[PDB]
Amino acid sequence: ANKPMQPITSTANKIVWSDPTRLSTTFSASLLRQRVKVGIAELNNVSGQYVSVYKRPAPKPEGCADACVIMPNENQSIRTVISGSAENLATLKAEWETHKRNVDTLFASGNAGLGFLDPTAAIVSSDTT
Amino acid sequence: DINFYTRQVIDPRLCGGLAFSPKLNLFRYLDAMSLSWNRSRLKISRAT
């Protein structure tokens, strides 16, 4: 398990959690509901905004440990935005699951985090045969 | 012939309870989450 957070700023379209032990870490969720019109069909769209932040002092120089190394604290933010029609949520999920695996094979297992891009990386679409 | 009047307390040590005691159903109630306004107090204190 891990440390759960409690919401500290709740709103109809704004909920923010933060760790009581480390208040720097946050997770924010914003939903924007809007009605969009397409051909002979009124559509109810929602945009899911998700921001995860972890404040962290990154590298320990080589391999020592000591008091007088309190290096600057930097930030690690991962923002995810999801948009789509409300009733297509059933298929909206699956491609989100596809989006998971799709970036997994590129960043989690690949070196995309370093800065490198792999043209021959295996990429798949939501639909299946 | 006897005719007199008296008034007596309800000896609240023994009697006087037997009621709802409105302490309960309110003490078990939000007293914790209402106290949890420490979140808002910390928020305002940070910018104070």
Side-chain angles (χ1 to χ4, degrees):
Chain A
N2 299 295
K3 298 183 179 181
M5 292 136 288
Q6 80 295 352
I8 77 167
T9 311
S10 176
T11 307
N13 65 343
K14 193 33 52 183
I15 310 173
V16 168
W17 296 258
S18 88
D19 191 52
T21 75
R22 287 194 38 89
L23 73 165
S24 67
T25 76
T26 58
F27 186 39
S28 306
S30 158
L31 271 64
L32 186 144
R33 297 148 285 251
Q34 76 283 15
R35 305 252 180 171
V36 61
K37 178 62 171 67
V38 304
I40 64 171
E42 182 65 26
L43 183 63
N44 50 5
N45 190 356
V46 57
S47 66
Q49 163 59 282
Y50 303 98
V51 171
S52 163
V53 174
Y54 190 93
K55 183 68 180 294
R56 173 134 65 194
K60 187 68 178 178
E62 41 186 290
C64 70
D66 57 354
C68 291
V69 168
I70 308 296
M71 65 182 179
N73 188 353
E74 51 84 18
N75 63 7
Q76 317 193 328
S77 73
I78 313 181
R79 164 159 58 259
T80 305
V81 168
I82 298 93
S83 165
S85 66
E87 69 275 16
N88 276 14
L89 171 153
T91 184
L92 182 49
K93 299 295 185 184
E95 61 86 20
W96 158 247
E97 168 51 40
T98 301
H99 177 92
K100 284 182 178 292
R101 167 172 142 192
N102 180 10
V103 60
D104 279 321
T105 184
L106 179 60
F107 170 82
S109 69
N111 313 332
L114 277 296
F116 301 98
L117 315 173
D118 177 31
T120 186
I123 313 295
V124 294
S125 59
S126 75
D127 56 352
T128 184
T129 306
Chain B
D1 170 33
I2 302 147
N3 166 257
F4 73 99
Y5 175 88
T6 45
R7 186 175 67 231
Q8 186 64 40
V9 310
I10 54 155
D11 58 18
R13 173 63 276 156
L14 182 63
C15 195
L18 292 75
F20 174 81
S21 180
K23 323 298 309 183
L24 61 83
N25 203 6
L26 182 57
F27 265 99
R28 60 138 293 286
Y29 185 73
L30 301 190
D31 287 336
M33 61 79 71
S34 68
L35 168 74
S36 80
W37 84 285
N38 287 32
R39 284 160 309 112
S40 60
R41 186 187 185 86
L42 173 58
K43 295 171 48 48
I44 177 57
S45 300
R46 205 199 309 292
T48 308

